[PDB]
Coordinates of C-alpha atoms and ligand atoms in Angstrom, one line a residue:
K1 CA -146.5 130.1 78.6
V2 CA -145.6 133.8 79.1
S3 CA -142.1 135.3 78.3
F4 CA -140.7 138.7 79.1
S5 CA -141.4 139.8 75.5
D6 CA -145.2 139.2 76.1
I7 CA -145.0 141.6 79.1
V8 CA -145.4 145.3 78.4
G9 CA -143.5 147.8 80.6
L10 CA -142.0 146.8 83.9
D11 CA -138.5 147.5 82.6
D12 CA -137.0 148.1 86.0
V13 CA -138.6 144.9 87.4
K14 CA -137.4 142.9 84.3
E15 CA -133.8 144.3 84.8
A16 CA -133.8 143.4 88.5
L17 CA -135.0 139.8 87.6
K18 CA -132.3 139.5 85.0
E19 CA -129.6 140.6 87.5
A20 CA -130.9 138.2 90.2
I21 CA -131.9 135.1 88.3
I22 CA -131.7 135.1 84.5
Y23 CA -128.1 136.4 84.1
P24 CA -126.6 134.2 86.8
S25 CA -128.6 131.1 85.6
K26 CA -127.3 131.6 82.0
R27 CA -123.7 132.5 83.1
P28 CA -122.9 131.3 86.7
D29 CA -119.2 131.8 85.8
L30 CA -119.9 135.6 85.7
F31 CA -120.9 135.7 89.3
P32 CA -117.9 134.6 91.3
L33 CA -118.8 136.7 94.3
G34 CA -122.2 134.8 94.4
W35 CA -125.8 135.7 94.0
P36 CA -129.1 135.5 95.9
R37 CA -131.4 132.5 95.7
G38 CA -134.3 134.2 97.5
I39 CA -136.2 136.8 95.4
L40 CA -139.1 138.6 97.1
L41 CA -141.7 140.2 94.7
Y42 CA -143.8 142.6 96.7
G43 CA -146.4 145.2 96.1
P44 CA -150.2 145.7 95.7
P45 CA -152.3 142.6 94.9
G46 CA -153.5 141.9 91.3
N47 CA -150.4 143.2 89.5
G48 CA -148.9 140.1 87.8
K49 CA -146.5 138.8 90.4
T50 CA -147.4 135.2 89.5
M51 CA -147.0 135.8 85.8
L52 CA -143.6 137.6 86.2
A53 CA -142.4 134.5 88.1
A54 CA -143.6 132.1 85.3
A55 CA -142.1 134.3 82.7
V56 CA -138.7 134.1 84.5
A57 CA -138.9 130.3 84.5
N58 CA -139.5 130.5 80.8
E59 CA -136.5 132.8 80.2
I60 CA -134.1 130.4 82.0
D61 CA -135.9 127.1 80.9
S62 CA -136.5 126.3 84.5
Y63 CA -138.7 123.9 86.2
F64 CA -141.5 125.9 87.9
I65 CA -143.1 124.7 91.1
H66 CA -146.1 126.8 92.1
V67 CA -146.8 126.7 95.8
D68 CA -149.5 128.5 97.7
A69 CA -148.5 129.3 101.3
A70 CA -152.1 129.4 102.6
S71 CA -152.7 125.8 101.4
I72 CA -149.4 124.6 103.1
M73 CA -150.5 126.4 106.4
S74 CA -153.8 124.5 106.6
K75 CA -152.3 121.0 106.5
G76 CA -147.8 117.6 110.6
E77 CA -148.3 117.2 106.9
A78 CA -146.9 120.8 106.5
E79 CA -143.2 120.3 107.5
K80 CA -143.2 117.2 105.3
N81 CA -144.7 119.2 102.4
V82 CA -142.1 122.0 102.7
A83 CA -139.3 119.4 102.8
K84 CA -140.8 117.6 99.8
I85 CA -141.1 120.8 97.7
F86 CA -137.4 121.7 98.2
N87 CA -136.3 118.1 97.6
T88 CA -138.3 117.8 94.4
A89 CA -136.7 121.1 93.3
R90 CA -133.2 119.8 94.1
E91 CA -133.6 116.3 92.7
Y92 CA -135.1 117.5 89.4
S93 CA -132.6 120.3 89.0
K94 CA -129.6 117.9 89.4
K95 CA -131.2 115.0 87.4
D96 CA -131.9 117.3 84.4
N97 CA -129.1 119.9 84.4
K98 CA -131.8 122.7 84.6
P99 CA -132.6 125.4 87.2
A100 CA -135.7 125.0 89.4
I101 CA -137.9 127.9 90.7
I102 CA -140.1 127.4 93.7
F103 CA -142.7 130.1 93.6
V104 CA -144.4 130.7 96.9
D105 CA -147.6 132.8 96.6
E106 CA -148.7 134.7 99.7
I107 CA -145.4 133.9 101.4
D108 CA -146.3 136.0 104.4
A109 CA -148.9 133.2 105.2
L110 CA -145.9 131.1 106.5
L111 CA -145.6 133.9 109.1
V112 CA -143.4 128.9 113.8
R113 CA -142.7 125.2 112.9
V114 CA -143.4 125.8 109.2
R115 CA -141.4 129.1 109.2
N116 CA -138.4 127.4 110.7
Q117 CA -138.4 124.4 108.4
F118 CA -138.8 126.8 105.4
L119 CA -135.8 129.0 106.4
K120 CA -133.6 125.9 107.0
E121 CA -134.4 124.8 103.4
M122 CA -133.5 128.4 102.2
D123 CA -130.2 128.2 104.0
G124 CA -129.6 124.8 102.4
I125 CA -130.0 125.9 98.7
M126 CA -127.7 128.8 99.5
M127 CA -129.4 125.9 91.1
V128 CA -132.7 126.3 93.0
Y129 CA -134.4 129.7 93.5
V130 CA -137.3 130.7 95.7
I131 CA -139.4 133.5 94.5
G132 CA -141.8 134.6 97.2
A133 CA -144.8 136.9 96.5
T134 CA -146.4 139.1 99.0
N135 CA -148.6 142.1 99.2
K136 CA -148.0 142.4 103.0
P137 CA -144.1 142.6 103.2
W138 CA -144.4 144.2 106.7
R139 CA -145.6 140.8 107.9
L140 CA -142.1 139.4 107.3
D141 CA -139.7 139.7 110.2
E142 CA -136.0 140.8 109.6
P143 CA -134.6 137.2 110.1
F144 CA -137.0 135.9 107.5
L145 CA -136.1 138.8 105.1
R146 CA -132.4 137.9 105.4
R147 CA -133.0 134.9 103.2
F148 CA -134.4 137.2 100.5
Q149 CA -131.6 139.4 99.4
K150 CA -133.3 140.6 96.3
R151 CA -136.5 142.5 96.9
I152 CA -138.4 143.8 94.0
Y153 CA -141.4 146.2 94.1
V154 CA -144.1 145.3 91.5
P155 CA -146.0 148.5 90.8
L156 CA -149.6 149.4 89.7
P157 CA -149.6 149.4 85.9
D158 CA -148.6 152.7 84.1
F159 CA -150.3 154.1 81.1
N160 CA -148.7 151.8 78.5
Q161 CA -149.4 148.7 80.6
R162 CA -153.1 149.7 81.2
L163 CA -153.5 150.2 77.5
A164 CA -152.1 146.7 76.7
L165 CA -154.4 145.3 79.4
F166 CA -157.5 146.9 77.9
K167 CA -156.4 145.7 74.4
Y168 CA -156.0 142.2 75.7
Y169 CA -159.2 141.9 77.8
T170 CA -161.4 143.8 75.3
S171 CA -160.3 141.7 72.3
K172 CA -162.6 139.1 73.7
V173 CA -165.7 141.3 73.5
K174 CA -167.6 143.5 71.0
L175 CA -166.8 147.2 71.4
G176 CA -168.4 150.1 69.8
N177 CA -166.5 153.4 69.2
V178 CA -164.4 153.0 72.3
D179 CA -161.0 154.7 72.5
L180 CA -158.8 152.4 74.5
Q181 CA -156.2 155.1 75.0
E182 CA -158.8 157.2 76.9
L183 CA -159.9 154.1 79.0
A184 CA -156.2 153.8 79.9
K185 CA -155.9 157.5 80.8
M186 CA -159.0 157.2 83.0
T187 CA -157.7 154.3 85.0
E188 CA -154.6 155.6 86.6
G189 CA -154.4 153.9 90.0
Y190 CA -156.3 150.8 89.0
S191 CA -154.5 147.4 89.2
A192 CA -154.2 144.8 86.4
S193 CA -157.0 142.7 88.0
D194 CA -159.2 145.8 88.5
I195 CA -158.9 146.3 84.8
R196 CA -160.0 142.8 84.0
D197 CA -162.9 143.4 86.4
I198 CA -163.8 146.7 84.7
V199 CA -164.1 144.9 81.3
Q200 CA -166.1 142.0 82.8
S201 CA -168.5 144.5 84.4
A202 CA -168.9 146.6 81.3
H203 CA -169.6 143.3 79.3
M204 CA -172.0 142.2 82.0
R205 CA -174.0 145.5 81.5
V206 CA -174.7 144.6 77.8
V207 CA -175.4 140.9 78.5
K208 CA -177.9 141.8 81.3
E209 CA -179.6 144.2 78.8
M210 CA -179.7 141.5 76.2
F211 CA -181.5 139.0 78.5
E212 CA -183.8 141.7 79.9
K213 CA -184.8 142.7 76.4
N214 CA -184.9 139.0 75.1
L215 CA -182.5 139.8 72.3
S216 CA -180.0 137.1 71.0
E217 CA -176.7 139.0 71.1
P218 CA -175.6 141.9 73.3
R219 CA -175.1 145.3 71.9
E220 CA -171.6 146.8 71.4
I221 CA -170.1 148.0 74.7
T222 CA -169.8 151.9 74.6
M223 CA -167.7 154.5 76.4
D224 CA -170.9 155.2 78.4
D225 CA -170.8 151.6 79.7
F226 CA -167.2 152.0 80.9
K227 CA -167.9 155.3 82.6
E228 CA -170.9 153.8 84.4
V229 CA -168.7 151.0 85.6
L230 CA -165.9 153.4 86.8
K231 CA -168.5 155.4 88.8
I232 CA -169.1 152.3 91.0
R233 CA -165.8 150.4 90.8
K234 CA -163.0 152.3 92.5
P235 CA -159.3 151.3 92.6
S236 CA -158.9 148.5 95.1
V237 CA -155.5 149.9 96.2
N238 CA -155.8 153.3 97.9
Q239 CA -153.2 156.0 98.8
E240 CA -152.7 154.6 102.3
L241 CA -151.7 151.2 101.1
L242 CA -149.3 152.7 98.5
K243 CA -147.5 154.8 101.1
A244 CA -147.1 151.7 103.2
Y245 CA -145.2 150.1 100.3
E246 CA -142.9 153.2 100.0
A247 CA -142.3 153.3 103.8
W248 CA -141.4 149.6 103.8
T249 CA -139.1 150.1 100.8
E250 CA -137.1 153.0 102.2
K251 CA -136.9 151.0 105.5
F252 CA -135.8 147.9 103.6
Ligands
CL1 CL1 -149.9 140.2 92.2

């Protein structure tokens, strides 16, 4: 569904995806020195890596093949599955004159037989892209990383993104006099998925009250409800984990 224009902020992430995938897919003649087919999206979990990847496929009218690495690693059947993913990508790309994107969620789960088969297919496509997503980029060894020449940090949401997230999630519920700009100010450090969880939990407070009081509709959610949720629900990404991303980035 999603396109770049549905996505608030992330201007640097968008630019880096345009440079790596959208521009060369639209104008391959403008990249005579070549371009990477392996894009690594990395950073804290619950920040829209999957949605960014889907949005890229929409921008370039690509086929999108969504792969979860943990499901491949629990199949033998696994090498066959890796081969079949890349060959489906190739055959559909050529047959329809259209790029194909293989999105591999939790790519670090591949970590050696599957790892080796995977890298051989990467070398082989080098119009198919592989976007790998990880929140543990330190788990990838340097040889593995050499097939991913574009590495993009996807950050925690900033003020404008948090505000758009609250607007989106709360449009589904009944709010009282709740200033969404102040909820966004108070949530510096929380991830996109923490924000969804905050709204769900604030709604759960009023629903639970409605049942306990035997009423038929919940009351409006108030600022008091959100603050009570934020006392218990802390950012799921702490300072330690964030400095690990900075250290990995400067190193790589
Ligand atoms: Cl994510």
